[PDB]
Every structure is written in structure tokens, then in C-alpha cells.
Write an enzyme that holds these catalytic residues in place. Sequence first.
Site, PDB file in Angstrom:
ATOM      1  CE  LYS A   1      17.902 -57.490 100.597  1.00 51.88           C
ATOM      2  NZ  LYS A   1      19.029 -57.612  99.621  1.00 51.88           N
TER       3      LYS A   1
ATOM      4  CG  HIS B   1      16.517 -22.761 100.931  1.00 53.18           C
ATOM      5  ND1 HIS B   1      15.380 -22.119 101.369  1.00 53.18           N
ATOM      6  CD2 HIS B   1      17.138 -23.228 102.039  1.00 53.18           C
ATOM      7  CE1 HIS B   1      15.316 -22.195 102.686  1.00 53.18           C
ATOM      8  NE2 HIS B   1      16.370 -22.864 103.118  1.00 53.18           N
TER       9      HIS B   1
ATOM     10  CB  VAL C   1      14.531 -54.159 102.603  1.00 52.00           C
ATOM     11  CG1 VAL C   1      15.694 -53.949 103.573  1.00 52.00           C
ATOM     12  CG2 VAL C   1      14.799 -55.349 101.691  1.00 52.00           C
TER      13      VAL C   1
ATOM     14  CG  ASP D   1      20.704 -57.531  89.266  1.00 52.32           C
ATOM     15  OD1 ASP D   1      20.653 -56.821  88.237  1.00 52.32           O
ATOM     16  OD2 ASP D   1      19.765 -57.608  90.083  1.00 52.32           O
TER      17      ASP D   1
ATOM     18  CB  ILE E   1      14.552 -48.605 103.301  1.00 47.27           C
ATOM     19  CG1 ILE E   1      15.017 -50.056 103.350  1.00 47.27           C
ATOM     20  CG2 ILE E   1      14.623 -47.964 104.677  1.00 47.27           C
ATOM     21  CD1 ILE E   1      16.340 -50.239 104.070  1.00 47.27           C
ATOM     22  N   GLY E   2      12.307 -50.086 101.077  1.00 52.64           N
ATOM     23  CA  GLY E   2      12.176 -50.580  99.732  1.00 52.64           C
ATOM     24  C   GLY E   2      11.556 -51.954  99.661  1.00 52.64           C
ATOM     25  CD  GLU E   3       6.671 -53.065  97.523  1.00 52.14           C
ATOM     26  OE1 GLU E   3       6.691 -53.392  96.315  1.00 52.14           O
ATOM     27  OE2 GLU E   3       5.614 -52.888  98.161  1.00 52.14           O
ATOM     28  N   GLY E   4      11.904 -55.552  97.995  1.00 54.57           N
ATOM     29  CA  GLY E   4      12.934 -56.360  97.404  1.00 54.57           C
ATOM     30  C   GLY E   4      12.370 -57.449  96.515  1.00 54.57           C
TER      31      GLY E   4
ATOM     32  CG  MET F   1      25.380 -49.281 103.167  1.00 54.09           C
ATOM     33  SD  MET F   1      27.089 -48.795 103.545  1.00 54.09           S
ATOM     34  CE  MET F   1      27.423 -47.590 102.246  1.00 54.09           C
TER      35      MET F   1
HETATM   36  O1  LIG Z   1      18.296 -48.292 101.106  1.00 50.10           O
HETATM   37  C1  LIG Z   1      18.915 -47.875 102.074  1.00 50.10           C
HETATM   38  C2  LIG Z   1      18.763 -46.450 102.559  1.00 50.10           C
HETATM   39  S1  LIG Z   1      18.431 -45.275 101.242  1.00 50.10           S
HETATM   40  C3  LIG Z   1      16.682 -45.255 101.260  1.00 50.10           C
HETATM   41  N1  LIG Z   1      15.913 -45.119 102.343  1.00 50.10           N
HETATM   42  C4  LIG Z   1      14.610 -45.139 101.841  1.00 50.10           C
HETATM   43  C5  LIG Z   1      13.387 -45.040 102.498  1.00 50.10           C
HETATM   44  C6  LIG Z   1      12.236 -45.090 101.745  1.00 50.10           C
HETATM   45  C7  LIG Z   1      12.281 -45.234 100.358  1.00 50.10           C
HETATM   46  C8  LIG Z   1      13.480 -45.336  99.686  1.00 50.10           C
HETATM   47  C9  LIG Z   1      14.641 -45.281 100.449  1.00 50.10           C
HETATM   48  N2  LIG Z   1      15.976 -45.345 100.106  1.00 50.10           N
HETATM   49  N3  LIG Z   1      19.757 -48.643 102.817  1.00 50.10           N
HETATM   50  C10 LIG Z   1      20.092 -49.997 102.628  1.00 50.10           C
HETATM   51  C11 LIG Z   1      20.180 -50.621 101.387  1.00 50.10           C
HETATM   52  C12 LIG Z   1      20.516 -51.951 101.338  1.00 50.10           C
HETATM   53  C13 LIG Z   1      20.757 -52.618 102.526  1.00 50.10           C
HETATM   54 CL1  LIG Z   1      21.185 -54.300 102.531  1.00 50.10          CL
HETATM   55  C14 LIG Z   1      20.674 -51.936 103.713  1.00 50.10           C
HETATM   56  N4  LIG Z   1      20.349 -50.633 103.774  1.00 50.10           N
END
Ligand SMILES: O=C(CSc1nc2ccccc2[nH]1)Nc1ccc(Cl)cn1
EC number: 2.7.11.22
Lengths: 327, 248, 826
Positions: free
Chosen positions: A42, A326, A27, A145, A19-22, A102
Site C-alpha cells: 500500500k 465454460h 496498492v 468500516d 490490485i486496487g486504488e486505496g 490474500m
Molecule cells: O486484493 C487482493 C487480491 S484480490 C485482487 N487482485 C486484483 C487485481 C486487480 C484488480 C482487482 C484485484 N483484486 N489482495 C490484498 C488485499 C488487501 C491487502 Cl492488505 C493485501 N492483498
Amino acid sequence: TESDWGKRCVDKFDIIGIIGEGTYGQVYKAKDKDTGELVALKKVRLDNEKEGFPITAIREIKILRQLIHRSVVNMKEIVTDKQDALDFKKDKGAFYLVFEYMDHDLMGLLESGLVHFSEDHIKSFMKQLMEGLEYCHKKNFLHRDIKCSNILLNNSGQIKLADFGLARLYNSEESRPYTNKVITLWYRPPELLLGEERYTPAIDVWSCGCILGELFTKKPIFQANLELAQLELISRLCGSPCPAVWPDVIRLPYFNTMKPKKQYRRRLREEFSFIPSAALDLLDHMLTLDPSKRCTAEQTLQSDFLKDVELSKMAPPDLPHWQDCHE
Amino acid sequence: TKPCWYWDKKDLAHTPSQLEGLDPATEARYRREGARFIFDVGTRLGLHYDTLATGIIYFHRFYMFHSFKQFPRYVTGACCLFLAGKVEETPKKCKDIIKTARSLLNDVQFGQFGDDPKEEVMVLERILLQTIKFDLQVEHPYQFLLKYAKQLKGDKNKIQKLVQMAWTFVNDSLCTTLSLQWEPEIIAVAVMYLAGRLCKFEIQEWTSKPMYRRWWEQFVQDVPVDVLEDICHQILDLYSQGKQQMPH
Amino acid sequence: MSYNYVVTAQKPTAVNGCVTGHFTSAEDLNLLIAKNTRLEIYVVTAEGLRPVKEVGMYGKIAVMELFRPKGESKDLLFILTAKYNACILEYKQSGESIDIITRAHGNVQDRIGRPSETGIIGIIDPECRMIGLRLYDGLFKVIPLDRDNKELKAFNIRLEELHVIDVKFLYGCQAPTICFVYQDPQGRHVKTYEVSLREKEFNKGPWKQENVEAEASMVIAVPEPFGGAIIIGQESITYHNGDKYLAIAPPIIKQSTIVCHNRVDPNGSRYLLGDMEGRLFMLLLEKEEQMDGTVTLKDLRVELLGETSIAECLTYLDNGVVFVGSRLGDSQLVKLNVDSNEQGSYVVAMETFTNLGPIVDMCVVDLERQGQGQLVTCSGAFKEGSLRIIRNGQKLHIRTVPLYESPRKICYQEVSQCFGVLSSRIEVQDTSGGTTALRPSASTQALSSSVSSSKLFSSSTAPHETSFGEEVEVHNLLIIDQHTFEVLHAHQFLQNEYALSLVSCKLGKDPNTYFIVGTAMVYPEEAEPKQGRIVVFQYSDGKLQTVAEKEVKGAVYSMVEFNGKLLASINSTVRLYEWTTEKELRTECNHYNNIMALYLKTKGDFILVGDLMRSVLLLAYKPMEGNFEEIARDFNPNWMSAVEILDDDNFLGAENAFNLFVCQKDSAATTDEERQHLQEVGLFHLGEFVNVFCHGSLVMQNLGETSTPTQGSVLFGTVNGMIGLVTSLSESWYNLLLDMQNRLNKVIKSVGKIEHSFWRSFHTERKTEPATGFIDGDLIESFLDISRPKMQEVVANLQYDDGSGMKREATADDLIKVVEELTRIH
Ligand SMILES: O=C(CSc1nc2ccccc2[nH]1)Nc1ccc(Cl)cn1
């Protein structure tokens, strides 16, 4: 017991994706095998062996186990990779910080532009953020931040604060030398542009005001790439830093060094005439140059805009739907 | 939610160190030396008193889950101080802690750090975090000694003498397992109680309830004198065993 | 880094606006037609239009208006681009030399402001004293038209009414006056203000506010003889002017929303109105003159004239001729007759101007075995729905297949010598409880027909009430012959079932070639569908047989064949199915880190998923394990409209902000994180909305055609009919062509003095970045059209690199040859 962190293995989670690079690691979203609850893990890597466990993670572990709030993210537990048997020195496996998942983050929702915030939606969103900030500020913790990306939002409409990597305790009696550059330039307070180094909790307030304006315009208010350029944009709208509006501006290191082109007058009310009156007042106070005259988190909660907002009605935003896909 | 970090005195007969054949006196001696090593190393590095105490509390907690015969104390101590610095935002580089540790330790003692001192320490960080169950926030008697002293009103000089004497007793209790028996709030009261007895001061007079002879009950609820005496006895034992005497 | 080259093969064809006036000469009658980024200038004759000039602008034309300020002999042209580039233009002709003059120019963007829902509106005062712009909620911007304002400097007036629907300057006022419809919680209202250039604020307007229809859409400024304004809605047309109020609510207009208006008689007696179903009306202002000598408005009447194409803009030219500017279908010249024909119509078509319409989907197929390849596009919407077969032969040859219903997806099935086309038609709830189609169309005129009898969702117990008159979509699969393009078969899908995806392929060990359609159960109550079907059809002997059906818990947005298996995206899940020996689909592996999986593309064992908001994801099928692996994802957030795989490392995507980007694997395995990060190395604004990326080229290939420096071929279709081609370059060729662009931009004069570098800058409401990794092929190809002095000026000090000669300055003749080879890719 539930309190024995660091021993349970990450086997207990079936990873879904990334879901992302911290900052200290990537993460990855995952599902708890036993309960089914979605969590986001994380990854913390101590293999670098430069300075050991990242302090950024240490801050998030220390502060978030103290902070209990609807609007502040929950670190559920800490899990580990399968550790090497009876050989800790060879072991280089990573550790994971399990948090609640979230569904979306505000920066992503705004970037697509799909979401359409009403006044009531903003009221609910801002109220939660300020309540969360107030809780943290009352416990004498500074976020440092505040970014759109660090504001997580479930489809339900609940908001949670997220990246406590740069958070530290604030002492009113003892001024402490801190790190000048903390908040991202787009949301950074003016005092820190001039380098106060001894900053108040009001730095977070400035950012949240930039977010408040951003929700109304669907665009970050002050977008620049250079610290002086940001001061100019801020100065055009909020007025040029001057002794009359900021008596102690002369004590700031770069006040003589960093100067706007002109001594611009304040135009905030004019350029934001479209914003509702109740909210415009909140913005004028939140985007006050002098940190001492800038409103507090509690004062924002006791404002006409937010005081009578009821958290029972969260006002779920217009989240992108299938017809929204759409053309 | 949160872990339990307090044991009964009777439980210390069953630490890993005890069960591997170490006698009570030796483990007591080993704790004082490790604590004082942490205290001395960090003081040379200029560290805040909370940072020293945090490392010491990690240290004491660690050897409730492990044996002194398998984990050299001085390496552990250095590791605790290293982590404490990051937790309490008074960070130090591991090489600098080793440098100072070498300055203060003789050749035999520094042999614990093995061929690569930094590595032995940095490696231990993994075990320390898991051992202290990632419960990094720690409260210390110091903040309560001051919070409670601020509510005393009277002779400025008699109260400052009480505080410093009590402050010294706090520093001395870090060499003991009191950190493992009683919450810090109780420790702060106990050291106020001890200094009051020694200076022949009657602290209730300085409180908002001058006819409340059990003055501490307004600071710390549910503390019998039994506890405060047990703590005082343990603190003064350190002075009697050593050559040092009560500060007065 | 990556290097790519984008060229326009067919220019935008949809009409976005059209005006009439006296622009080329104070004497001629001009028709200016605006297509996206393109301005066409015509002169009106007695037979039709004489083209005179066409220019491109480095921007999407948002406002186009002609005006004539006191002291000018002829009309001047105002244009505002969607990136807020404003300019005033003049036509000047010197014998045979035609050029366009930029008289005034500037960018009117505000640092802070909320873009309005009803889009940019631009109007000009009848006395040509000022230009009014509605760009942001709560603000009215005024550019005063004084001689000295060569930079188009402007100021904002605070506007209390935040949600404005439409605004016009009124005729017959003592001061510049605006009349507008606005929306607040109490409904919609009409209100007036006066505009004071001296005070730079609004003053009280000439007449009071009136509450108007809830769906009041357009404001018509009535000329001096009557004065006032007309307000067009869904059910009613009203006239307002101080104390005067009229309202006509003829039942005929309630049937279809009216979208465009034009004035026939300069005095305001007659106006033209058009609606979304293509009907053309005449609005009549019936005059009554009092003995006072004054002229008042007695009544309004609406008269149906006939049918035109669904029109974005109408403009009456002269005599009986009207130009119909269409965005969803072909534009037209039609003649209005005083006498109706035997069918009752007063409208007879004269000419038809090809509009490729919205290109929803397209496929490139070699029908004649020519090796040239032909492009069949799903074009148009509703009545204008069409299939367009496009071949190169110097102009493009285009054939049109009328469908009279909306085409959605197309795929070619060679084994059956036919195409499969997904389509939808509009029926309306009728008194029978069922629905009735407004007109016959492809799905009803098929030779043979069938209807799904699936029982999958038949359990229902979920109520969906129907009101008479409401619209519904009826989706169908059409089987269409590749030579005649005759509808051989139409399969009608279930009630409230929308067809989203279509493939033609063989699966597993099954020798039969199937049409497979992915559908979704769409109910107004649901924000996202929770039910769907994957259906396997076989087209055999003139009949379509239902072979197998698989129930899915969502919408099957996209499907693609994957090495004998079926890869389908159902809502958040990407799922791979195997085709068993029992002719049924079997779930193999799933992926769920997707918000909404809208687009799928495959190369080898690699898959690219386009999310609604999460950009692109590179997946891989791992055959040793029988599951999916996430290779790398683009963390930068973009809204996706179409995606394509360029090569094993480069991936192409289209943003809904009309922008284009290319991501590449970091190919540096230092840390696992670097590989799992897709870095956007290409950014290009493009200016068009891409719906379909399709590998292929229309150029004739005899196997002997010199291989161009550009490698690869991706064609893309857009909403405005523009077709473009994306191709890759070597580093050396890119650096050369890029260096040449910078030289060309200094030489070539832009209309409106718009910087080319700004036009191609990647731009979202939130961000603006300089373009990277892309060569504007249209800028490169314009080198051949600039005069010789300019050509030699461009090549000055231009040296070669990394070639046979490491430094080799080129001449104007060297570059003419290079570009000419680059023009042979399309
Ligand atoms: O980031 C989210 C979901 S939204 C999202 N999913 C993706 C999947 C791929 C790329 C970008 C994304 N953006 N949840 C979250 C954030 C912080 C913590 Cl601590 C726990 N969970």
C-alpha cells in the site's frame, strides 16, 4: 533487525501489477525478491504536504502492529522509495505498507456470483470474522468500516479483516464524540443513520449481520443511496425505530427528523424463512435496532450456529474453476 | 518483531550529541527545554496529557539516534507534538503549532524554524517516522499510576494525595531520560514509592496483601528497590538543581 | 464520456419456449413461439403455420402460458420476464388492425430472496384460480386470478423444502394442489400440498411423499381420466397417485437425458418425450377400466419414434404434425406416421426453420472480393453443429454447412483458400477400452486425416480410470475449403486435450502462413488445467504438417498475433513469444496480475485482457524495454464473456449478466492514479449473451456509399443466435438520438406496459443502474413504424444543436430521413 521499519527499500520487491486504488495511495501486488512470498504494498504519499503522513495510514500502522490474529491482516513491514542522499527536505519519496497477499476479496467473489456458499462454508467464514472481531473488540478497537470489500479470503478458506483506516479505540467509561458517518451506507448501522456520534462496538456487529444475510441471499440486504432511504429499507425488515424497541431512540438527534413512511412491524423471520433456524436467530440478534440489545461478538461465537463449528475444517468455498468459466 | 526502546544510563555518555562535543549537562539542559517546550505548546493548545507525553517520548528517542547540533530541538519538538497529535487522535494543524510556538519562543529561539517554520517541521516528519522505526504506540506511567491506585483501599484522602503527588512526579520525569531507561510500569511504581516515602504512608496496608512489605511486587514483577531508588534519586535531583521543591 | 449506438442485425432465432391454445380467437388453433424478447404468434393449418403477429417485449420471456378463466371467450396469455415483469395479455383484432392488450401488469420481485437453481418456474391452476411462481428458494408466490387484481398483487407462502426441482398444478383435486420434486440430503422426493387462497398458506396434500430417482427431473401433470402425476428421470419413468404406483425403466432412455415433454391426447393417454441426442419417444398410458366404471392406469410403455433436432420445447399441433422448438439447432415441423418407413422411423421432416444456434465464434471475410463481406459463424452444438455463411442481399442470405459435431473456433487463412475450424465430438467409453462415436461427423469424414503423436505429456504416471458408458470430448482441427466448404483435413488432438484458441498468421521473418492452435490437458480431477500445448501447423498440399510445439503450464485460453510475435494467455499469465529462425517459439515477456486471462485483443502495441472476474485490463508492449506495462484497469468487478477494442481510448466488454459496458482511459494525467483507472462510461443491458466481438460490416461497399454519422463497426454474436452491431457517435448525434428516445418512449406503447428505461438498465443480481452512453438502435428504428400522428407528436419542440444551425427544430420528415440512413448500417 526485523523491527527496524522504514529503512529497507522497495527495491526488494518485484511489482506484479496493481490490485486496487486505496485511500492514501494505490496498492500494488508484488513478490519479495529474497523469499518469493507474495505481498501487497500500500503506497503512502507525503508529497501532498497538506497535513503530512495520512492519519488513515497512521491508524493502520498503530493498530495492526498491536493486533495478532488469524482473521486480522498482517502488516509485515514498511519500506521506502530510494531516498534522496543527504537531503531530506528535497526528498518526497513515498512509503509503502507491506501486507500479506490474500487471493480474493468477498465483494469481488459475490459480484461475479460464481461462488456458491453452503451453510458450512458460511459457518466457517462467519466464525473467523466474529473471532477476529471479538479479538479486536476485546482490545477495545472499533473497525468502523465493515464492508464486503474489506473482507479478504484466501482460496484456502481463511478470512482476514483489512481496512483499519477508520479504526479507533472505544472507551466505555468516557463517552467520546466521534465521526457520525463512518460505515458505508449499505452496511451502516441504524443508530449512526440517526447520528449517535457516541457509538458502541455494536456498529460493527450490525454490518457483519448484513454480511451474514448477504451470504445467504447472494445480495446486499439494504441497498440504497440516501440515509433516509436506508432507514426505510432497514425499517421495513427490522421494524421502524420506536421507543418500545429502542427506549433511547428519542435521544438520537434525527429521530424526529428522520422518520419511516409507516411504523413498520418486524418481518425478519418471515422474509428470511429460507435461512436455517440456527442462522436466522443469529441474524435477528445481529440486526437489532437498539445497540444496547444487539448481540456482542462473543455472543455470536457462543451461538448454536457458530459454537460447534470447528476451525480445523475451514470449508474452502466453491471457488470458480475452469469448467465454471465454460458456458 | 518489536524494537528495543530502553538504554542503560552508562550508554547516554555516547549519544550523537555527546560525541560531537556537547557535554552531559548541556544535553541534559537541551532535553529539559525541548520536553518542556513540547509540554507548554500542547498545553496551550489544550492537548491531552498522553498526547504531550507521546511527543516527548518521540523527542527523547529521536536524539538517541541524532545530534542536537544538526537538528534544532524546538523544530524537532514541534514535529514530535504534531505527529503525536495524529497518533493519539488529538490532531492539530501544523500552522497552529507554529503559531503557538512563536507565541512562546523569543526571536532568537524561533530562528531555528528558519525562513519557513511550517516547512522545516513538515519536512522533519519523514525522518521522525524512520527514526522511531514506525513504532507509534506508546504507554505512559499515567495509566499504571491509576490502574495500581485503583487497587488500593483505605483513606480516600491519603490515597488521592499519593496519586496527585505521584502524578506531578510523572510530569517532571518527562524532562529526563528515565523514559529511555525504564518501562512506564516501573516509573508508575517508582513515583508511588517516592510519594509514599515523602507523605510517610505505608502503602502495603492499602493492598490486598497487607503483610507483603514489598507492596509493588504484586503490580510489577522483578523490580529491585535498587531501581526504584535510582529513579527517585533522579527525580528529586531535578527539584534540588532547580529552585522548586517537592510538591507535598 | 463516450457515445455509442447498438442495433440488432439479426433477431434471436433460438426457440426458448412454445405453447398451443386458442389465443387469437376462441376458434383458431394457435402456436405461440417464444424467442428471447420476441413473441411469434402462428395459426395452425393443414399444411403448416400461418404467421399472424409478432411483438417484441422489453424483457427476456421467462414464463409463457395460455389459460382461459371462466367468463372469457378465448385464452389469455401470461408472461413473466427474467427481471420479474409480469403481465396478462389479450389478442384483439379490428378488421385489418391487430394489437396486443395489456390486461394486468406488475413487477413481482421480492426485496429479499435467494434465486433458485432450477430457475423461474411458472404454472397455472387447471381452474385458472391462481398463478404459481417459484422464484426464490424456500418461497412459493401466488398471484390469485381475481377480476380485481389488475396490478397482479401477490403473497408468499413459506415452503419448508428449500431445493425444489420442478412443480406443476395437479388435475382432479378438490382444492388447488401442487405436486413437486425436491432435493434434501436424503435424496429426491415427490410431495404434495394444497393451496388455500382464503388462508394464504399450504395445507396437507392429497397423497404422501414418495422417494424418487436421484436425478428426477420433470413433473408431468396427468389429466382428469387418470389423474395424478408422472415423474421423468435419467433411468426411469414413474406414475404416482395416492395408493397407485407404477415404474417403467426401459434401457433405451438411460442412454440420453430426457429434457422436454408434451401431451398428445388431451385425456393423457399419450405423451411425447425428447432427449439430448435428438431422439423422440412416445410415452403410452395403458388404460384398464373396472366393472365399477372407474378408469385406472394399468401400465406405462415407451416407444421410439425417430429423430428430431435437439429440442428445448415440443408441442403437438394436430393430425400428425409436431413443432420441434430447438435452441441448439434448427427448429422443425415433423409429421408422425402410423406406419414406419423402410428405415424403421415414424418421423419425417416437413419444414426446417433456420436457427443460428449458439454462435461460439465467428469471422468476417470477403470471400468473393465483393467488398460486401461475408460472415461465417460457428453455430450449433453436437448433431446440430454447423458453419453458417451469412451475406446481405431486404433479407439476409444464410448457407448452412452441416458438421454433426460441435464447432468451437474459426479463423480464415487466405493463402490456403480455406478456413481452420476447431471442433469437438462426443465418443463414449466402449467395451474395447477405447471409445466409439455416436454418429459420423466432420472430423471423421475428412478427406485426409492426422493424429498428434506428441510425446510432451507421455510420461504420465497419473491415473485416470474409465468406466464404460462415460462421455469424452475428442477435439479436432478441421481444414475446410472456402468455396465448396468440404472438409479437406481433420487433425485429431491428444486424448483428453481440449482445443481452446486458434489463429492463422505469419511470424517473425518466416514467410510461411501457419495455423496455430492453443490446447489444454483437461482431466476431471483438476479444477484448473495445469498442462498445455501451443502447436504450429502448416497446411500445404492437402496435408497438415506439425511444425513446432511449445509446452506451457496451463490452458491456452486465447491467442492473438502481435506485430510478428505470438501473444498467448496461459491461465493467469499473458505471455509474448518470438518466432526464431529455428522455427521455435521463444518466451520474451510475461504478465501475471491476472486471475484467469480468458480473452485477448490487440491494437498497435496495446493489449486488452479480459479476466473471469476482474473486468478489463489495458496493457502495453514497450519495445524499448522488451516487457509489458499495466496502463489502466477497470476496478469495478464484472464477469467477462467477450471483449473488443473500439478505439485507442474506448474498450467494449460483455458481462455474463447479459450486460454491456464500455471503459475509457481517464486521459487526465494530473495523478498517475487517474490514468491507471479505467472509468466505465457506457452501460447497457442488451439482454443477450455475447460470445464473439468481431470488427467488420456486412453492408455492400462500392466506395461510393454515403458515410453514415455512425463511425466504426463491431459485429457481435450471441447464444440465442442474435447478431448485433456496435458503432460510435459524435456527442451531438448522441444527444439528439437520446433526446428522441425519451420522446419515443412516451409515445410508443409497450407490451406488458414495461418501461423501456427499466429494461435497458444495467442489472446484476446485486446491482441495477440506469443505462448510459448507448443508443437503443432498435428503439430509434421503430420511429419509422409508428403512425403519422405519433411521429409529429415525437418531433414537437425537438431542436438541433452544435450543427450548422445551433437551434433548428426538426419535422417528422427530417427525422424519417435520419433514421432511414441509420437503417443502412445493417
Ligand atoms: O486484493 C487482493 C487480491 S484480490 C485482487 N487482485 C486484483 C487485481 C486487480 C484488480 C482487482 C484485484 N483484486 N489482495 C490484498 C488485499 C488487501 C491487502 Cl492488505 C493485501 N492483498
